[PDB]
Design an enzyme around this catalytic site. Structure first.
Site, PDB file in Angstrom:
ATOM      1  N   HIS A  87     -41.699 -33.340   0.147  1.00  0.00           N
ATOM      2  CA  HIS A  87     -41.109 -33.984  -1.044  1.00  0.00           C
ATOM      3  C   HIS A  87     -39.586 -33.812  -1.063  1.00  0.00           C
ATOM      4  CE1 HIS A  87     -45.157 -34.458  -2.516  1.00  0.00           C
ATOM      5  NE2 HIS A  87     -45.363 -33.153  -2.469  1.00  0.00           N
ATOM      6  N   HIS A 131     -30.809 -28.802  -7.672  1.00  0.00           N
ATOM      7  CA  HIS A 131     -31.539 -28.045  -8.674  1.00  0.00           C
ATOM      8  C   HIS A 131     -31.680 -26.608  -8.204  1.00  0.00           C
ATOM      9  CE1 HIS A 131     -33.613 -31.872 -10.307  1.00  0.00           C
ATOM     10  NE2 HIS A 131     -32.386 -31.700 -10.812  1.00  0.00           N
ATOM     11  N   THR A 154     -39.535 -31.871 -12.842  1.00  0.00           N
ATOM     12  CA  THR A 154     -39.445 -33.312 -12.605  1.00  0.00           C
ATOM     13  C   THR A 154     -40.423 -33.831 -11.565  1.00  0.00           C
ATOM     14  OG1 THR A 154     -37.748 -33.186 -10.908  1.00  0.00           O
ATOM     15  CG2 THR A 154     -37.028 -33.268 -13.246  1.00  0.00           C
ATOM     16  N   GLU A 167     -31.534 -37.521 -10.629  1.00  0.00           N
ATOM     17  CA  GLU A 167     -32.633 -37.615 -11.598  1.00  0.00           C
ATOM     18  C   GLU A 167     -32.018 -37.768 -12.995  1.00  0.00           C
ATOM     19  OE1 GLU A 167     -35.422 -34.357 -10.462  1.00  0.00           O
ATOM     20  OE2 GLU A 167     -36.434 -36.106  -9.604  1.00  0.00           O
ATOM     21  N   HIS A 215     -33.131 -26.936  -4.269  1.00  0.00           N
ATOM     22  CA  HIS A 215     -33.453 -28.130  -3.512  1.00  0.00           C
ATOM     23  C   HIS A 215     -32.637 -29.262  -4.079  1.00  0.00           C
ATOM     24  CE1 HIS A 215     -35.952 -28.233  -7.123  1.00  0.00           C
ATOM     25  NE2 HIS A 215     -35.764 -29.542  -7.089  1.00  0.00           N
ATOM     26  N   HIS A 273     -32.467 -33.811  -4.761  1.00  0.00           N
ATOM     27  CA  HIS A 273     -33.115 -35.126  -4.896  1.00  0.00           C
ATOM     28  C   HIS A 273     -31.973 -36.073  -4.493  1.00  0.00           C
ATOM     29  CE1 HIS A 273     -36.470 -33.497  -7.294  1.00  0.00           C
ATOM     30  NE2 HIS A 273     -35.565 -32.632  -7.707  1.00  0.00           N
TER      31      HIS A 273
HETATM   32  N1  LIG Z   1     -37.411 -30.653  -9.668  1.00  0.00           N
HETATM   33  S1  LIG Z   1     -37.575 -29.316 -10.534  1.00  0.00           S
HETATM   34  O1  LIG Z   1     -38.072 -29.693 -11.825  1.00  0.00           O
HETATM   35  O2  LIG Z   1     -36.337 -28.599 -10.464  1.00  0.00           O
HETATM   36  C1  LIG Z   1     -38.793 -28.290  -9.790  1.00  0.00           C
HETATM   37  C2  LIG Z   1     -38.629 -26.917  -9.848  1.00  0.00           C
HETATM   38  C3  LIG Z   1     -39.541 -26.097  -9.219  1.00  0.00           C
HETATM   39  C4  LIG Z   1     -40.620 -26.628  -8.526  1.00  0.00           C
HETATM   40  C5  LIG Z   1     -41.510 -25.722  -7.740  1.00  0.00           C
HETATM   41  O3  LIG Z   1     -41.046 -24.700  -7.261  1.00  0.00           O
HETATM   42  N2  LIG Z   1     -42.795 -26.064  -7.567  1.00  0.00           N
HETATM   43  C6  LIG Z   1     -43.505 -26.891  -8.542  1.00  0.00           C
HETATM   44  C7  LIG Z   1     -44.612 -27.648  -7.841  1.00  0.00           C
HETATM   45  N3  LIG Z   1     -45.553 -26.730  -7.190  1.00  0.00           N
HETATM   46  C8  LIG Z   1     -46.596 -27.475  -6.468  1.00  0.00           C
HETATM   47  C9  LIG Z   1     -47.593 -28.147  -7.381  1.00  0.00           C
HETATM   48  C10 LIG Z   1     -47.654 -29.529  -7.468  1.00  0.00           C
HETATM   49  C11 LIG Z   1     -48.613 -30.155  -8.244  1.00  0.00           C
HETATM   50  C12 LIG Z   1     -49.503 -29.372  -8.928  1.00  0.00           C
HETATM   51  F1  LIG Z   1     -50.463 -29.980  -9.676  1.00  0.00           F
HETATM   52  C13 LIG Z   1     -49.478 -28.006  -8.880  1.00  0.00           C
HETATM   53  C14 LIG Z   1     -48.513 -27.396  -8.098  1.00  0.00           C
HETATM   54  C15 LIG Z   1     -44.830 -25.848  -6.268  1.00  0.00           C
HETATM   55  C16 LIG Z   1     -43.729 -25.102  -6.982  1.00  0.00           C
HETATM   56  C17 LIG Z   1     -40.780 -28.011  -8.485  1.00  0.00           C
HETATM   57  C18 LIG Z   1     -39.869 -28.846  -9.114  1.00  0.00           C
HETATM   58 ZN   LIG Z   2     -35.745 -30.844  -8.582  1.00  0.00          ZN
END
Ligand SMILES: NS(=O)(=O)c1ccc(C(=O)N2CCN(Cc3ccc(F)cc3)CC2)cc1
Ligand SMILES: [Zn+2]
EC number: 4.2.1.1
Length: 257
Positions: free
Chosen positions: A62, A117, A196, A104, A92, A94
């Protein structure tokens, strides 16, 4: 999970597996600069990254995550709108297929080329998994990227991308200093929101910096050579891995300046 950023599994499809996608505090959002209100009660933001310990960089299909050792209070974010201490776990980006899109959050509907982020979790909850189940579990520091002069501090990231081209690949990434990705000013906008990407949990206090950092066209071009696919699969360039702005609903965006 089969969610992604394609025409058949993109943001408009997420609500089917993750109904919270149409929730009350979803992210990202458009930041209307004229409507955001200065909040003199906000404290200065405190970014303490001097003891940050990066460990690895991972292409998760992703985006790519630069991971940190969060087993101790090393790199932390506090102050600003936050109560308590939040530990940096990963950062990370986007980005888009073109410089005119990729971020975003948007500012007065303006889309930046990319958005960084820096993800932190509230230490009162013990671990990241528990923190995402709480309304004040995470604090994500968002920083916009525009294309212009190169960002010296980002080059180490750009150069290691060749080694994690495809989904599932990781590489050692120690001694990377995230302070080199920060703009000069820490002025920011803040509002309550969500992750997000799925699971889209409503556990994030968003802190978005007003000042973008500049990266070079060659630097962002390298991001666009990554792949969403795994090794040995049809090449799907990793571009446009951003969720568009969501309804602000019953929320107010506050400005620190
Ligand atoms: N961009 S953001 O909002 O800054 C963000 C911040 C942290 C994360 C993050 O570490 N993961 C979230 C997603 N999960 C995997 C996941 C996906 C779907 C599910 F149903 C459960 C878990 C791994 C950990 C993702 C996005
Ligand atoms: Zn993010």
């Amino acid at each position: 999970h089969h969610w992604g950023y394609g025409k058949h599994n993109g943001p408009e499809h997420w609500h089917k597996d993750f109904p919270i996608a149409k929730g009350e505090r979803q992210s990202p959002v458009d930041i209307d600069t004229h409507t955001a209100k200065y909040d003199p009660s906000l404290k200065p933001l405190s970014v303490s990254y001097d003891q940050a310990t990066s460990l690895r960089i991972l292409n998760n299909g992703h985006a790519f995550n630069v991971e940190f050792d969060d087993s101790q209070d090393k790199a932390v974010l506090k102050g600003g709108p936050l109560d308590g201490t939040y530990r940096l776990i990963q950062f990370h980006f986007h980005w888009g297929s073109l410089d005119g899109q990729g971020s975003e959050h948007t500012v007065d509907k303006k889309k930046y080329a990319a958005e960084l982020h820096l993800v932190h979790w509230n230490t009162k909850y013990g671990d990241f998994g528990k923190a995402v189940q709480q309304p004040d579990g995470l604090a994500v520091l968002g920083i916009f990227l525009k294309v212009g002069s190169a960002k010296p501090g980002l080059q180490k990231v750009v150069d290691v991308l060749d080694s994690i081209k495809t989904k599932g690949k990781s590489a050692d990434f120690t001694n990377f200093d995230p302070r080199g990705l920060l703009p000069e000013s820490l002025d920011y906008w803040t509002y309550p929101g969500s992750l997000t990407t799925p699971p889209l949990l409503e556990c994030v206090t968003w802190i978005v910096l007003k000042e973008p950092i500049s990266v070079s066209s060659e630097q962002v071009l390298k991001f666009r050579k990554l792949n969403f696919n795994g090794e040995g699969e049809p090449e799907e360039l990793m571009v446009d891995n951003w969720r568009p702005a969501q309804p602000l609903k019953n929320r107010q965006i506050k400005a620190s300046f």
